[PDB]
Amino acid sequence: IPTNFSISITTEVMPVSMAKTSVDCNMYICGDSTECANLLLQYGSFCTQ
Amino acid sequence: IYQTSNFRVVPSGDVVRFPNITNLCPFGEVFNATKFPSVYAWERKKISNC
Numbered sequence: 001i002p003t004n005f006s007i008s009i010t011t012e013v014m015p016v017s018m019a020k021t022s023v024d025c026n027m028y029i030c031g032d033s034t035e036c037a038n039l040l041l042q043y044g045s046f047c048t049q
Numbered sequence: 050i051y052q053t054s055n056f057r058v059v060p061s062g063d064v065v066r067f068p069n070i071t072n073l074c075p076f077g078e079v080f081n082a083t084k085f086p087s088v089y090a091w092e093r094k095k096i097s098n099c
Contacts, residue, residue, distance in 0.1 A: 026055045047055075
């Protein structure tokens, strides 16, 4: 049977959020080539999905 | 809120800034001389990369 107590305080770290990233495929795909967009629009909604 | 499309600024002007002139031609110097040969002994100077 214990006779004395010991009040302790522990810590616990848990992530709840991350980096809200947003990549624009208009600049990533077809950076500056104006003729590149004509072929990029041929694929479809890969920049929308 | 519903994302629809993207936007981009269209370039209006254009900057064709080029480095200042390089190897200058000695044309400015061939017209400024104190002596010149005769007609039958004309000198043929080769000028290139100017």
